Every structure is written in structure tokens, then in C-alpha cells.
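Morning - 3PE inputs below, output right after.
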Amino acid sequence: MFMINVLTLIIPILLAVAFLTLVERKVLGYMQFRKGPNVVGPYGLLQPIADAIKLFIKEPLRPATSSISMFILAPILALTLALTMWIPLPMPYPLINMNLGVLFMLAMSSLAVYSILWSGWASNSKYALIGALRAVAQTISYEVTLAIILLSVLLMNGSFTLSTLIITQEQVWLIFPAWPLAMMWFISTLAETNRAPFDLTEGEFNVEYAAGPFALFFMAEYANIIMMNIFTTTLFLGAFHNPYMPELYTINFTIKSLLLSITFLWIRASYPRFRYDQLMHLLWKNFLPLTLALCMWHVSLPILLSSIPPQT
Amino acid sequence: SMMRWNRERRRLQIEDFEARIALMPLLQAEKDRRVLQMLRENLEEEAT
Amino acid sequence: MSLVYMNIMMAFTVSLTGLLMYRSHLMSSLLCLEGMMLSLFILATLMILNSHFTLASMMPIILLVFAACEAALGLSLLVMVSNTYGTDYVQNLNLLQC
Amino acid sequence: MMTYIVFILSIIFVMGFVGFSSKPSPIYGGLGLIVSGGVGCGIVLNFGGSFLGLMVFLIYLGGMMVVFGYTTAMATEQYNKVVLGTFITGLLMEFLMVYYVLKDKEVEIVFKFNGMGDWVIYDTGDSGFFSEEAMGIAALYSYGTWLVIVTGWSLLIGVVVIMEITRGN
Amino acid sequence: VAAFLKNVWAKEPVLVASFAIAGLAVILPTLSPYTKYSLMINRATPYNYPVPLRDDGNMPDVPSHPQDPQGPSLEWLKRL
Amino acid sequence: MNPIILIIILMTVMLGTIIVMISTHWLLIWIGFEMNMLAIIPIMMKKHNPRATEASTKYFLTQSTASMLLMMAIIINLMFSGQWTVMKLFNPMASMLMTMALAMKLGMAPFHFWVPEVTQGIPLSSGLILLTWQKLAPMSVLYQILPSINLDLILTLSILSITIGGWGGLNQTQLRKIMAYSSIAHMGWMTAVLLYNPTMTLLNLIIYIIMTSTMFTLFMANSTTTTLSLSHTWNKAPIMTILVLITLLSMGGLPPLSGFMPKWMIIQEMTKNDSIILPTLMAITALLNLYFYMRLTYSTALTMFPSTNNMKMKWQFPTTKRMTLLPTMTVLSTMLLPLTPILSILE
Amino acid sequence: PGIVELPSLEDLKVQEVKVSSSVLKAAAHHYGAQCDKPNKEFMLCRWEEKDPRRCLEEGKLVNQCALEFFRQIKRHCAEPFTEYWTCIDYSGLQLFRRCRKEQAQFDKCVLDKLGWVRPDLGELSKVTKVKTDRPLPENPYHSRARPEPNPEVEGDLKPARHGSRLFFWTM
Amino acid sequence: MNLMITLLTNFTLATLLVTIAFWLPQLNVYSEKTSPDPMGSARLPFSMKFFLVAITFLLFDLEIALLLPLPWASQTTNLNTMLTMALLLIFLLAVSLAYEWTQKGLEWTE
Ligand SMILES: CCCCCCCCCCCCCCCCCC(=O)OC[C@H](COP(=O)([O-])OC[C@H](O)COP(=O)([O-])OC[C@H](COC(=O)CCCCCCCCCCCCCCCCC)OC(=O)CCCCCCCCCCCCCCCCC)OC(=O)CCCCCCCCCCCCCCCCC
Ligand SMILES: CCCCCCCCCCCCCCCCCC(=O)OC[C@H](COP(=O)([O-])OCC[N+](C)(C)C)OC(=O)CCCCCCCCCCCCCCCCC
Ligand SMILES: CCCCCCCCCCCCCCCCCC(=O)OC[C@H](COP(=O)(O)OCCN)OC(=O)CCCCCCCCCCCCCCCCC
Ligand SMILES: CCCCCCCCCCCCCCCCCC(=O)OC[C@H](COP(=O)(O)OCCN)OC(=O)CCCCCCCCCCCCCCCCC
Ligand SMILES: CCCCCCCCCCCCCCCCCC(=O)OC[C@H](COP(=O)(O)OCCN)OC(=O)CCCCCCCCCCCCCCCCC
Ligand SMILES: CCCCCCCCCCCCCCCCCC(=O)OC[C@H](COP(=O)(O)OCCN)OC(=O)CCCCCCCCCCCCCCCCC
Ligand SMILES: CCCCCCCCCCC1=C(C)C(=O)C(OC)=C(OC)C1=O
């Protein structure tokens, strides 16, 4: 019965990632005064199926790999970490209810840069390796403000339990006491997933992969995008939870996470790219000083207000 | 809002902890009889 | 004593002899050194969680942090070596024989 | 089999160190130390140290071995008998240890070691509404004042030292 | 102190907001009247068991029952 | 280097050694050694040449290996004792590992193999710190763990350090390697009297630090790093030849000088314990150290080697170097033997 | 060493309180108010004797006083109690805050038919006092006699005889 | 146990998808491709700045590792000491950032 629950987690993740590509092409279409795909399916609904069948029968690109083993392991690690970031997510009950789900997610997202690094070294191109080092340095840079913003917000939660974070937000959304942490969190998770305006992998690392494994990297990246929007929804926009009707919470956080994923799609059709030093300047000289200052404020603030949340 | 609600959550935590404290003598007595039961069983099987 | 301590100590000695018998690279040496630190983390952690000595639970974190900072120092040393010879080979570090 | 699981993880742990102590290449060495950190984290998780195991992921693997693989990928330009011989040597030493301690329920390499599963040494009580490990780590700020002072000073000096010795001036 | 502050708020407002939020975080718990209540709530949270005392004969302020009047009270926590 | 950063880094070196000296917990001992190494690394790389970077790499590898063996000894102590007091060790395996770790930190033979390298690679001031201040913290831990130090181990390390540091300096023309092999021999002398009377260990440590600081301060005053460059001193600064004469005659243990004081007292505490062979062999092996000290005095003070023409220019510039405590250390390292019973202040 | 002495299985037989944890937590505050005295006798015995074998009979009194707590619920207020512990039982963390009207019905029915008052916030965590007739353990740790300490230093401090006596130094 | 089953299921699904991606289009009998980059064959130039941002990450991540027990540390009874040491750790992280600033460490990746 638990295996059925794992399947009903991981298969709808793949389906929502498959149709997020259609929603991206449609929403970027209408924001660009054109349409997105509407020929291949009725209202374009068969475009990801056609595209997946297209990619899985395209010729393998057949690279000369430096290491065969890491060339195999980087999609494996990317997909495995893309799927295991969902199991502590409370919606309203997680698959794996654990005491440290927040720290688990921060750990399994910290492990995600090895896929980029192994895919960059396993290609024989030095240019792909330079791009992989830039992407790894970018991601590990913004993980710093992920960790500190996340700690500062969980000082109002009392624990690293993600299910406690719904109980925390039953009177107010947590964006109202923590909107500067929310906006720096939102831009930092936008910079985690190599997403525009932080997509320097498309601006002039896994270009030596064939269409199959490049599609697997692509779907792991969109699983991370949907997951970080769901995690931002649970973290700052906590919905009402009636324990006798859990589908109220499920419909509500689904609507909020869809709006937040569309907000990623709406950012990428609005801004030009940063130069690499410009988002390094954005992290180390703008986001991190305010993040440390708000970390001091959210340490000292439940003590000066007598609003220290419960441990349990 | 977080001030009012975390104060209410602390009072609810103290209520749950005093429910636990009111239950701890009975659970301690049952735990003592549990471990003495298991040690007597291990003792008799060691003797045989 | 307990059987898992055997394997954690033997892992420490394996990474010791790896750190005490270089092949060519300084990076492989630092990998063996941090394997030694990892085995110390696991062993101190299993002791402190075993005996329920509560205050020492902050001990391995400290044992992480300092030593991880130590690793950073070694990596920078390696980079200065690699800013002289082009490799991190330990056989290039023999200017001090005379 | 399942009552020995930490032991089994620990065997993988020893195998993982022979994955890089033989030193095949520093990138395969990095991969072996990553797998070793994962299984040793699992060992930490199975005594109840969840926070310490997630420090092994977040700080040791996701923090530091990232930097090892990063620095290594900026060297060793991309394209043994002693490596495979030392690897099978360490593997056969470890499985001889396994076979001895499983056929005798007692072994002595340097210390005496029991051969039963390490589930036996545990405690039979509860810790209430706290993890003792979590509260001992929370004690770093109230009881651990001098430790926080010297650790933060060493990290500040570490930043200063890294900036001094990498400048070249 | 006046032109310098407007100058740094014109050039580098992120740093001014940083040092302002950090300065409030430093000074404001020493000036807040609710800082004492944080202490009083954290010491009133019963993680352990209140192990009772042997009544030797002279303890006038220790109760015999939890609902007795003497002892520590938390009416300040209910009311606030 | 920025002088503020230099002051903060030297205070962090001193802070790590003080944290080793004043702490009662083993984790704080390990933290003091980590802080001390982490802060002394830029003092070695002060002049930024590949010899300093190589020396810092070798120093990092040896001290990191010693710190890992130290933490393993501490962890085995927590196994077999359940506690963390900096006192005797409750396992001979942890005692052996901690004695090995501290021998690696001191550079005692056969872990001596980093001391003549690193001291050659680094400047004279950083070598002064390495050979005087960096001997304080492991000798403090050896002072506090001596009820559990194995006798044959510490005496093997001691005689092996004395013999190897004696035969090291006979082949040496570089002054920093001469001071390094002198360091290995004198650390053997310090740890040999350790389990018998650690007050004489402290006396030997203080007199050795005074004499080594005198010799490095003379080397920095004359800007000489080789024997043949030290031989130019009589034509430039004739008083400095007299100072290196009396200090090197002191370091060989020649009476009536103060460097005779420790080793004699060491013999004075080893014939009480019915060890007669061992201080005799140690005293006879110290004649090797005295032989290359005599070689340096022949090259510098007792003869006049030929100088060059450009020395005539340096006659017109007096020494603008801050020769800190050089008269004080020169007097204390030579004329202190009539104050031999002052050693009771170290009890 | 010696043989450990365990009680027989007849000494451990008692009518077990076979109710679930939600039944315990729903009835918790009235159990802590009404079954105060033998519970605190037992826990004082348990922290003073430091040995459960010396604390069995008092524990039986606990297991005697708990059941009379529940029968007296079952004789008068079984239906509001059942409605209350069912709603407590539904929750995963067993929240009191989800179940306030059932608690109100149960407390109203207990206060009417049995006169029991629920403890206020802060009362069941008070450190109370217990009047016992059992003696205080003079050696609860079974500790033996400590070793006698080393003799102190005392008396006036005279100077050293003939100075330091170091080979020839007359002072 | 449920978590180990979940991790094994996710790894097995990922390995199955990777095997299908690496072996289903291999059955295409298309053609043998004869003679299968901005830099031609030059060595990779070492960038000091990439290593600097990686070590700065590592050190600030260690300071984060010190900061991680704070939601549990706010529950203490010694709150003045706890608040002082928490503000001191975040202040030492800020002093590390300010020293990284003013000695030109955050340059060309600012
Ligand atoms: C009314 C209110 C006022 C009352 C005032 C009362 C006093 C009035 C007179 C004022 C002056 C008093 C002077 C101190 C008292 C007498 C001390 C004395 O002679 O002890 C005899 C002492 C033992 O003889 P004694 O027959 O058993 O005792 C007679 C008294 O009862 C000795 O009495 P004690 O039993 O109490 O003596 C204790 C103990 C007695 O001694 C012992 O227990 C034996 C161990 C002594 C140390 C031996 C070390 C051996 C290895 C190192 C060798 C060092 C180098 C040798 C010389 C090289 C060139 C300088 O002494 C020591 O442990 C101190 C160490 C030695 C220093 C002696 C005092 C020197 C003051 C002047 C310093 C100037 C440089 C002097 C030479 C520096 C080297 C010593 O003689 C020796 O050890 C021979 C060595 C030379 C002694 C120094 C002579 C002092 C006068 C020197 C003037 C010429 C200077 C020329 C320019 C500078 C040099 C080129
Ligand atoms: C969770 C739901 C969503 C949350 C909100 C986010 C949605 C909006 C997204 C919009 C599209 C963003 C696209 C990417 C943009 C990236 C660039 C960017 O914005 O850079 C950030 C810019 C960077 O600066 P800059 O580059 O614009 O400015 C120039 C900077 N210098 C001079 C250094 C070159 O600003 C920040 O870093 C601000 C971060 C958030 C600030 C929060 C402050 C809160 C107020 C504190 C108190 C202030 C008063 C003083 C104290 C009073 C006390 C009582
Ligand atoms: C959780 C919910 C997830 C939902 C995911 C999917 C969303 C979209 C679902 C499908 C929507 C309708 C799709 C219709 C596609 C077009 C079908 C069509 O018209 O095909 C015509 C073609 C030729 O037929 P012919 O006989 O030649 O016609 C001449 C007429 N004189 O004949 C053919 O092509 C042959 C028939 C092909 C039929 C394919 C149907 C689509 C299958 C998509 C996969 C998903 C199925 C649904 C899953 C969820 C519901 C259980
Ligand atoms: C290169 C190799 C292949 C690469 C791809 C695959 C590997 C990488 C991706 C997978 C990473 C796996 C991470 C496994 C551990 C994660 C930490 C963890 O388990 O945390 C959750 C939880 C802590 O929460 P808590 O609530 O305290 O526990 C329940 C008790 N209340 O703890 C628990 O619930 C504990 C449950 C029991 C112990 C579980 C042990 C799992 C097995 C060992 C680790 C497996 C991974 C090894 C390799 C890692 C390589 C990075
Ligand atoms: C005491 C409170 C706690 C303080 C410590 C905690 C701080 C938390 C935030 C972390 C800050 C970390 C980074 C700090 C770096 C400071 C140095 C700096 O940035 O100087 C350079 C800057 C000018 O920028 P520039 O170099 O030109 O940059 C190139 C792009 N144009 O120069 C400037 O912009 C001038 C910066 C200095 C003056 C700032 C004044 C702010 C005053 C706010 C109101 C009062 C708040 C109370 C505290 C006052 C403390 C001074
Ligand atoms: C039980 C025992 C407990 C402990 C007892 C106390 C132990 C004391 C250990 C002393 C260790 C001294 C270490 C070296 C001094 C520290 C400061 C330093 O680095 O000084 C050197 C400094 C560097 O200047 P720099 O610019 O690098 O010069 C290069 C040339 N252009 O400046 C120079 O180069 C200037 C040249 C002269 C420097 C002379 C310094 C002498 C210091 C030692 C004095 C003697 C020790 C104290 C008295 C005895 C105590 C035992
Ligand atoms: C079998 C489950 C799905 C496997 C993955 C294939 C489908 C999803 C990725 C395909 C894809 C789409 C739709 C796509 O639109 C796109 O362009 C933006 C890609 O290239 C960057 C893609 O890779």
C-alpha cells in the first residue's frame, strides 16, 4: 500500500513536469503577443507526448566521454535528487513525515550540483567544463541565502518539521512577517534552478548528452522548479488546513503553487539575463548582507516580542 | 499576528506537556512491570 | 566492544595508510585526510549517541567545522602548488632537499 | 540480516574508503568519498542522529566535497595495477574480518570486538518530547559560549588566512 | 551625520537597510518590555517531570496537590 | 602583509597555544592546535616564493596528520573512559597515538623529517616561531598526560631524536637546517627527562627557547642564512661574532655557561632513577651538536674568512634593525649558570 | 559477582489499564488532578529508591487508582467521554485544540455528576510535597566507603634548611 | 524503512529511465558517422576567482553550520547568553563578509 503511495507521488510528478513544458510554451506565447502550441493536440495537449516520442527515437549524439561512469551517473543523480525533494513536502500530509524535512530538502538540494559538475567533467569539451564550473559556483552561491533565509523563517516555526509550518501559518501567511526574506528567497530559488534571468547555460554544460539524457536533465530541472514553488508555497503562503477535509488544503496549495510556477514563467519572459559577475554581485553584495541583517532581526525578534514558537 | 499565535501555541504546548506529566506515573509503573517481566522470563529461560 | 566500532576504526586506518602512502597527487592525499576526518565524525557520533552524553552532541559538528576549514586551507595550498608546476604532483615538491 | 543493517552499512563504509585510499584518480576518489559519506551518514541516522547525518549531507558532502570536486575539476586535464591490487587487498582484509567475526562472534585485531549485531547496545527508554541529540546541539549557545567564541574566531581567521595565502603578495 | 547618512542612503541603500536592521536587532531586546516574558515562558515549559519532595514537616510554600493555591502560578501567561 | 593583519594572526597563534595551555577539555586542546596551525600558515608564506609554499604544504600535511591522530586518541579515550578531562589517558592505544601525534607536532625522530625542510623554506622570523613558540603546546600536553606515557616509547623517541639531530647538523652548511637539527636533538633531551622530572623538562624548554631566540635574533640582525654568509660578520659587526661565539658555546652545553645547566640537571634527575647508561649515551651524543657549533664558531668568530669589496660600503650604514631583547637574551643565554637553583620556580 | 534478585511473576500480576493513548490523553488532566496522591507517592519512591523492584506495590496502587478513575467515568459520563476521546483519537498529533466542544461537554458532565475541576494551565507541572511512611534511603546508590583523603598541609612555614642544598649553592 | 524503500524506488525509476534513454535509440541502425569548441586543444586555464568563490562558499557554509541549531536554541532558559552568542555568530559572518569585501576578494565575481 505504501508502494502505491510512492507511485502516486512519483508518476504525477512526471506528468506535471511533462505538461509544465506545454504551459511554459503557451504562457510564453501569449505574453509575446502570439500563441503557443495549438496544432499538435487539441489546444496543444499532445505537444509534450509528441516531443517525448521525438526525443526518444532521435539518434544518440554519441560523445567521447572522459568518464563513462559519471556520464551515466549525472542524469541518475539529477533525477533521483529531483524526485526525493518531494517526499517530506506536506500537502497536507507528506509521503515521508520526518522531523527534519526542511534540513533534508536543503541537504538534497545541496547535493544537486554534483550532477552539473559530473556532466561538465564527463564531457571532453573544456568550454562545457567552464560552463559547468560557472553553474556550480552560481548554485552553491545562492544556496547560502537559501540556508540563511530558511533558518530565519524557521525561527518563527520552532522546528525543521515541514508539517509544523502549516500550523505556524494558521492565523496569517508567513509572508506578512517575512516578505523581505520571501522576495530574496524567491529570487534565490529562481537562481537555484538556472532559471531566467539567471540562465547562463543558455547565454553566450550538458550539451554532449543525447536527446534522451538531455530530456532527463530537462525534466529533473522542471521537477525542481515545481518542487521549489511548492516549497515556497508551504513556506510563505500556508493554506488553510481542515483535518477532516484535507482536499481543501490540497486544492489551495495547488492553486498557489501553479500561480508561483506561472510567476517563474512570467519572469523569464520579462527580463534580460544578468552577466555572470552581475548575479555574483547580486548575491554577495546585495542579498547576503540583508539576509544576515534579517537573520539577526529574526533571532532577536521573538525574544523582544515574547513570540518564541514551540519546540514541539 | 505571529506574537498572538506563538503565545497561544506555547500555552497549547504546556497543556500537552502537562497531559504527558499526568500520564507519566502510570506509564512508569507499566514500564517497570514490563522490564521486570522480560528480565524474569530471560532468567527462567537461562535457568532451563 | 560493539561491532560497528571495528569497521569505523578500520576505515580510519585504511584512510590513514592511504594518507600515509602517497601515489602522485596532493588532492588524493587531501581526500584520504578528509576520509580520516569523516571516520572520526562517525566514530565520535556513535559514541556520543550511544552513551546519551547530551552536551557532547555539539562536539562532532565542531569536529566537522574546524577540520573542514582545515580542508579549505589545504586546498588553497594545493592551488599554490598548482600555480607553480601546472600539476599537483608531490614529486615536484622537492626543492627543500638542499 | 536486517538486525545487522548498520554493520552491513559499516562494511560498505570500509569498502568505500578502499574506493579512494587506493587513490585511483582524485575524481574517482571524490566519488568514493561521497558514497562513503552517504553510508556513514546512514550509520549516524540509525543511532538516532538525524541532525548530525544531515550535517554530513549539507556540510560534508553538499558543502565540502562539492569544493573538492570543484577544485579537482579545475585540475587533472581530462583524457591501474597498483590501484586494483591495493583495492582487492583491502577488500580481502575486510571480508576476512567479516568472516572471522561472523564465525567466532568475537574478534581481536587491536581491540576486542563482539560479533553480534550492534542493536544489542541500545537503550530501552524514551526521551520524551525532545531529541537528546537535538537539545545537546541547541546547548551550543547557552552552555557552549567559549566554544562558539573560539570557533567563530577560527572561521574568521580562516577567511583572513585564505585571502592572504592565495593573493600571492 | 546628516549629509553622510543621506549620501549613503542615496548611493548604497541596501547597506543602509542592512546596518539599520542589524542595529535594531542589537539594541531593541535590551529596550523591550516583553523580553522578560520570553524568559518566563521558556522556564515555565515543563519538559521534565516535576519530581515531588518528601514532606519533612516544614515546607509551607510547597503544595500537596496541583490545584492548591500555593506554588508557582501562570495566570500572567493566560491573561498577558 | 598588512601589519594589522600580521598582529591579528600572531595573536591568533598565541591564542591557540594559550587555549592548549589553559583548557581542561580535549576538544579545546584539539581546537587550540587547529587554530595554531591555521594561523601560522601565513607566517610561513610571508615572502611568497615556491620554497615557502612547499614548506607550508609539508607543514600542513604533517600537522594535519598529527591532529587526526590526536583526535583519534581523544575518541579512544572517550571510549575507554567516558569523559573528556585533560589528564592521564585510560588506554595504552590512545596513549601511544597521542604520544605519536605530539611527536609529529614536535618533530621528534623518526617524525623529524619535516623540520629541516620547512625551516629552510620559511624566513628566519617564522622559523624562530616554529622552533620556539610551536614547541610550547605539545610539551604542555606531554606535561599533562605523563602518568600514561609509555616509558620505552618516550625514551626511544628521545634517544632517536638526540642521535638523529646530532648526525643531522654535521653535514649542514645552511643555518636554518642547523637550528632544525639542533631542535630535534634538544626535543629529545626534553622528553627524555619527562617521565622522571618534568620540571627539568620545563627548564630545558626555557633555556632552549632563550638560546634559539638569541641565535635567530643574531641571524636576523646580520641577515645571514648560510655559514659562509655568517662568516662575513667580523668585517661588518665584530661584536656579533663575540655574541654568536658565546651563544654557540652555550648551546653545546659547555660550562660555565647556562646551556650546560639543563642537560646536567637532566643527568641529575636520571641518575637518581638508576638510569646511568642512558644519560651517559645522551651526553656523549651531544658532542656531535657541540662539534657543529664549534664549526660555526670557527667560521665566524675564531678565524677571519675573506670578505669582498662591497663590504666597505656597508661600513657606512649602522644597523637599523630592531634587535629586540638581543642583549637581554644574550646575557640570559650565557651567564645564568650561577643562578642554577632558580629552577624551583618551575616546580 | 552476585546474583541479581528479580521478583517473581506473581509479584507482577495486576489488572492492567488496557486503554489507548487517546483515551489516556483525553482523560489526562482529570487523572492528574484526581489520582494525584498515589501517583506522587510512587514517583517519589521511584526517584528516591532508584530501583523499580523497590517500587512495585506503590505502582500497584497507581494501577489501582487509575482503574477507579475510569470506572467512575464509566458509571456516570461514558458517552461524552467516548465522544471526546474519539475526536482526540482522530488527530495525528492528538491535538486538544481541535476538540474543544467535546472537551466542554465532558468537563461539564464531569463537573456536574462528579464535581471534578480541570487543572488550570501551570498546575499539573507544580512540584508538590508527599507525606510518606517509608524511610528515606540512606544509600540509594549502594555506594561503598570512600577512600580516606591525603593529609593536608598545616603548621607554620619555616625556611629551607641551609638553602637549596643543590650540590654547592649555599643559598 | 519507508524512506529506504522510497529512496530505492526513486533510484530504480531514475536508473530505468536512464537505461531507456541510453539504450532504446541504440537500436536505430541509422549510419556510421565519420569523424564525430571555442578552444581547439589548449589546456584549461586555471581561474583563481572560481576557486576563491568556492572557498568563500565553504567557509560561509561552515558559519551556516554553526547557525543551524538556532530554532532549537531559542527554546533555552539562558536566553541572554543565547541571544548574545547568536548575534555574535551572525556578526562574525558579517565581519567575514566585510573583510572579503574590503580586501578586494569579491572582484570580477562581485
Ligand atoms: C648594613 C646593611 C648592608 C649590608 C651589606 C653587606 C654586604 C657588604 C658588601 C657589599 C657587596 C656584597 C657582595 C655579595 C656578597 C658576597 C658574595 C660572594 O663573594 O660570594 C662568594 C662565593 C662563594 O664563596 P664563600 O666563601 O662560600 O662565601 C663568602 C660569603 O659568605 C658569600 O655570602 P653567601 O654565602 O651569602 O653567598 C651566597 C652564594 C654563595 O655562592 C655559592 O653558594 C657558590 C656558587 C656560586 C656560583 C658559582 C657558579 C659557577 C659556574 C659559573 C661561573 C661564573 C663565571 C665566573 C666569573 C667570570 C668573570 C666574571 O652566592 C650565590 O649563589 C650568588 C652567585 C655568585 C655571585 C656572587 C656575588 C657577585 C656580586 C657582584 C657581581 C659582579 C660579578 C661577579 C662575578 C660573576 C660570576 C659569579 O664565591 C664564589 O662563588 C666565587 C665567584 C666570585 C664571587 C663574586 C665576588 C663578589 C665581588 C666581586 C667584585 C669584583 C667585580 C669585578 C668586575 C666584574 C667582573 C669582571
Ligand atoms: C514569495 C512570493 C514572491 C515574493 C516577491 C518577488 C516577486 C517579484 C519578482 C520581480 C522580478 C525579479 C526579477 C529578478 C530581479 C533581480 C534584481 C534585483 O531585484 O536585485 C535586487 C536589488 C539589488 O540592488 P540594485 O542592483 O537594484 O541596486 C544597485 C545596488 N548597488 C548600488 C550595490 C550597485 O535590491 C536588493 O538587493 C533588495 C533585496 C530586498 C530588499 C528588502 C528590503 C526590505 C525593507 C527593509 C527595511 C527598509 C527601511 C529601513 C529600516 C527601517 C526600520 C523601521
Ligand atoms: C491525469 C490526466 C492526464 C491527461 C493527459 C492527457 C491530456 C490529453 C488527453 C487527450 C485529449 C484528446 C486527444 C485527441 C487526439 C486526436 C485524436 C484524433 O482525432 O486522431 C485521429 C487519427 C486519425 O483517425 P481517422 O480514422 O483517420 O480519422 C478520419 C476521420 N474520417 O486517429 C488516431 O490518431 C488514432 C487514435 C489515437 C488516440 C490517442 C488519444 C490520446 C492519448 C493521450 C495519452 C493520455 C490518455 C489519457 C490519460 C488520462 C485519462 C485516463
Ligand atoms: C553515486 C551513488 C549513486 C548516486 C545516486 C543516489 C544517491 C544520492 C541520492 C540519495 C540520497 C539519500 C539520502 C539518505 C538519507 C537522508 C537523510 C534522512 O534519512 O533523513 C530523514 C530522517 C530524519 O528525520 P527524522 O524524523 O529525525 O527520522 C525519523 C525518526 N523521527 O531519517 C530517517 O528517517 C532515517 C531512516 C533510517 C535510515 C536511512 C538510511 C538510508 C540508507 C543510507 C544512505 C543512502 C544513500 C547512500 C549514498 C549517498 C550518495 C550521495
Ligand atoms: C552596529 C550594528 C551591526 C553592524 C554589523 C552587522 C551588519 C549586518 C549587515 C552585513 C554587512 C556586511 C557587509 C558590510 C560591508 C561594508 C563595507 C562596504 O560595503 O563599503 C563600501 C561601500 C561603498 O560601496 P563601493 O565600494 O563603492 O561598491 C562598488 C559598487 N558601487 O561603503 C558604503 O556603502 C558605506 C558603508 C558604511 C556606512 C553605513 C552606515 C549605515 C547606517 C545605518 C543607520 C544606523 C544603524 C545603526 C548601526 C550603525 C553601524 C555603523
Ligand atoms: C613554561 C614556558 C611557558 C612559555 C614561556 C614563554 C615562551 C616564549 C617563546 C618566545 C617565542 C618567540 C617567537 C618570535 C617572536 C614573535 C614575534 C615575531 O614574529 O617576531 C619576529 C618579527 C618579524 O618581523 P619581520 O618584519 O617578519 O622581519 C623579517 C625581516 N625583514 O620581528 C623581527 O624579526 C625583529 C627581530 C628581533 C626579534 C626578536 C624576538 C625575540 C622573542 C623571544 C624572546 C625570548 C623569549 C622570552 C623570554 C624567555 C621565556 C621562556
Ligand atoms: C517519458 C517521460 C518524459 C521524458 C522527457 C521528454 C519530455 C520532456 C522534455 C522535452 C522537452 C520539451 C517538451 C521542450 O519543450 C524543450 O524545449 C524548451 C526541450 O528542450 C530543451 C525538451 O527537452
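Note: The interface with chain A takes residues 27-28, 31, 34, 50-51, 54, 57-58, 61-63, 66, 69-70, 73-74, 78-79, 129-131 of chain D (CB under 8 Å).

O.
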